[PDB]
Amino acid sequence: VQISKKRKFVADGIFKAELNEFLTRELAEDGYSGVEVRVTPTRTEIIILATRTQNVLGEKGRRIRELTAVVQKRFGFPEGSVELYAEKVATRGLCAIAQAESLRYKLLGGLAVRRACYGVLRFIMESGAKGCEVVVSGKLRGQRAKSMKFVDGLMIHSGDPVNYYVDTAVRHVLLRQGVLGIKVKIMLPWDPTGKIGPKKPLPDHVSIVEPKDEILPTTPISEQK
Amino acid sequence: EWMPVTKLGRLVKDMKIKSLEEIYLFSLPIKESEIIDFFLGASLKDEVLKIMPVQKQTRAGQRTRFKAFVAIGDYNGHVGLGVKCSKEVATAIRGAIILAKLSIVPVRRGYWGNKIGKPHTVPCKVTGRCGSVLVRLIPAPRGTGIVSAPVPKKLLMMAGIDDCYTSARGCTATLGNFAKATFDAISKTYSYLTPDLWKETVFTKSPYQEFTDHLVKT
Amino acid sequence: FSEWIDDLEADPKGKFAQNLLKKLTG
RNA sequence: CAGCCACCCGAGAUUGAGCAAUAACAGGUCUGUGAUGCCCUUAGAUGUCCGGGGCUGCACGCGCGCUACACUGACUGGCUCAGCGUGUGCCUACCCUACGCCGGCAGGCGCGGGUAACCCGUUGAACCCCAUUCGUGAUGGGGAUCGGGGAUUGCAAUUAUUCCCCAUGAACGAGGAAUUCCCAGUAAGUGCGGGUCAUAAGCUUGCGUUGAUUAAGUCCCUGCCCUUUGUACACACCGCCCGU
RNA sequence: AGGAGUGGAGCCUGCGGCUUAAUUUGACUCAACACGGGAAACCUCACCCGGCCCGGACACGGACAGGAUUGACAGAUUGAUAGCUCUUUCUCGAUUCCGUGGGUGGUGGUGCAUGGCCGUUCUUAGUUGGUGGAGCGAUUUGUCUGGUUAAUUCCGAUAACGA
């Protein structure tokens, strides 16, 4: 039943990858954003984040139970030890996956690709992110394919901060004429006390507290207590 | 909320300047479009004359920017022209609108023959020049309208000119030069010394001098 | 609206170039 | 000034990598894709089925290393010492290694030490401090080419692919014009765990292991960049273009 | 300056010419040729042969309820233990069969219609706005004569300033 810790760790990572793949293939239509796992003694819960909670629930709450049984039956775990929650994201603006899927489903429904990209850029910048880029590549006008960019704000591409200050999301739009590749890079802002962005600043950013203005003393003036 | 950056902006925001004409009288540079919004920003109409894609050759492709030529002006006595180039068309139009507001000039209107009513045409024949493009405005009788190409017609209508004859020479196909030449011709209307302007100028107190105390104390 | 602006920036010198530039204002 | 060069001090007075921008290449990948569009498809198939069938086939040269040229060392053993790590299984059968004996070898049987720095193992690995020959060599090194004996996962190992002993054993005095990679625990000589994998390495990777003088410079052979400059090039010199 | 010493001289996956049924190819300077994480009997096998289920669901016609495969030893024989195909008809019970397609799957093509991933320019030191200045404009300055640095690194000069 038990195996060494390295193999169990890689197996848990594999299970997380499987779960995320199945969910992003299933509920991306419902504004799916992300998944997470909590493990208690002899129990495992998996939580999800998606914009449209009522749509992701469905009717009679049937989808959650159905999918939970699916994963329970898929991964062979002891039955009754898996439960799937229903949570909404903190915001759809600072999440790269959510905006990538929004752009995807604006593209599939029929719309000028550059109108959709402009709209997603405006939506990102009213959301308060420190910057972003979106690249839509494929066959737009003609038979040749030209990768097409949009940037706003500022984006960093190097060092360690890209590990936590930049969120990357790559997706595909399926079209009658071809497949469009969509890459999205978002830069989270310096957001302590709430953890929507990083709690730590950019390592190259130095902030100086402003000097306090006080009356410069002339003579010792104390009062007895 | 407009927070002025210049002395003229502070005077305009604090209702020290009562019209655009006091600013024009002293030839002060207007560097904030909020001054123009304060004084005329209830009758100003903008119009994008052109979007022109220009290209700079580079190692691995042509960098393409878009230049917006935008005319602005309430259709009475004021007109401006702005040209702004940027990588985005919307940003270019926004910048061109700001620049056209910054370049708004007073338009002098006169009479063709007898002087019944309000002025309707240019006071005299004026000529504007821009890169081989020569635009001549000639006073016309009342009710003739603007006899011009569409590009100068837009600016002449936004300037409040009811009727005017025009002549053009050069490469007027370049809309930017055509527009700048007719803007020069329009702006030369008030710089022309006609015999009704021979009266000696009675100098007044400049805005920076007449409200220097307000600027110091605010 | 901005649809023409955006499709123009995709192909500034494409087949749909004079049309879109004119559709902006003319 | 920004800095540079030495010295005191200090462990360290430049440790080594990871990530790595515009904008692009009709670079590669439709043989990863259950990411795939449009033609070829729609059973006289374009698959798992016997694996039966093959790059382990040969008249020369280019292309990444080791053995080698020895009295700088093969050589009897006296030996004292590593680092990184995979390691007995919710369809995952395949696991690294001690007690007794046998046999030169592949291995054997009883519990087997392994949920870990407890097990391998105070990882008793490479050279050398010595012990017969060689005392200046084509041989004992080069066993690279042909005989014969065994085991452990293999339904099958033929074209012995896989692991040990016996002998006939070949240029090898600095190795063609011409070249590749190199600055301090560094070029190198050596073993170990992996992608390899049914024990599976001549590749690679990662690790230690004993470990080196020219170098602290410059713009020549080579390139990439910058500035000026010329252009009739802009599909950008693999350009453009003249005449027969 | 040179140091392991290169191709040198036997034996490497590997490439290139290689008949044959195919020795298959994809990938030609650095930026292919111990690369496809390629030491292959079998999954690396794509390619040469004979069988394996049609992976055929709508329309419409058959014995139309008994339609037809696994039935170790001998016989029909590119398997006699695949009945793979035979005079016989040696077995689940009607989801098996045929024709215009249909939805299918092709490591079948086009990477010169596309993705993503990677290589490369390039791991050098480059790149770009805003405001200001110059030019009718494309553009230019900032982004520079110098010194300095591993570095567009920073000084300094300075129509630029601040990024």
JSON list of C-alpha atoms in Angstrom, two decimals, chain A residues 54-55 57-63 65:
[
{"chain": "A", "resi": 54, "resn": "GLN", "atom": "CA", "xyz": [-23.84, 28.85, -10.62]},
{"chain": "A", "resi": 55, "resn": "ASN", "atom": "CA", "xyz": [-22.98, 27.64, -14.12]},
{"chain": "A", "resi": 57, "resn": "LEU", "atom": "CA", "xyz": [-22.58, 23.83, -10.33]},
{"chain": "A", "resi": 58, "resn": "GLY", "atom": "CA", "xyz": [-25.24, 22.94, -12.90]},
{"chain": "A", "resi": 59, "resn": "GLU", "atom": "CA", "xyz": [-28.72, 21.69, -12.01]},
{"chain": "A", "resi": 60, "resn": "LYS", "atom": "CA", "xyz": [-29.60, 19.79, -8.81]},
{"chain": "A", "resi": 61, "resn": "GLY", "atom": "CA", "xyz": [-25.87, 19.90, -8.04]},
{"chain": "A", "resi": 62, "resn": "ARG", "atom": "CA", "xyz": [-25.54, 16.83, -10.25]},
{"chain": "A", "resi": 63, "resn": "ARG", "atom": "CA", "xyz": [-22.26, 17.69, -12.00]},
{"chain": "A", "resi": 65, "resn": "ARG", "atom": "CA", "xyz": [-21.28, 14.58, -7.54]}
]
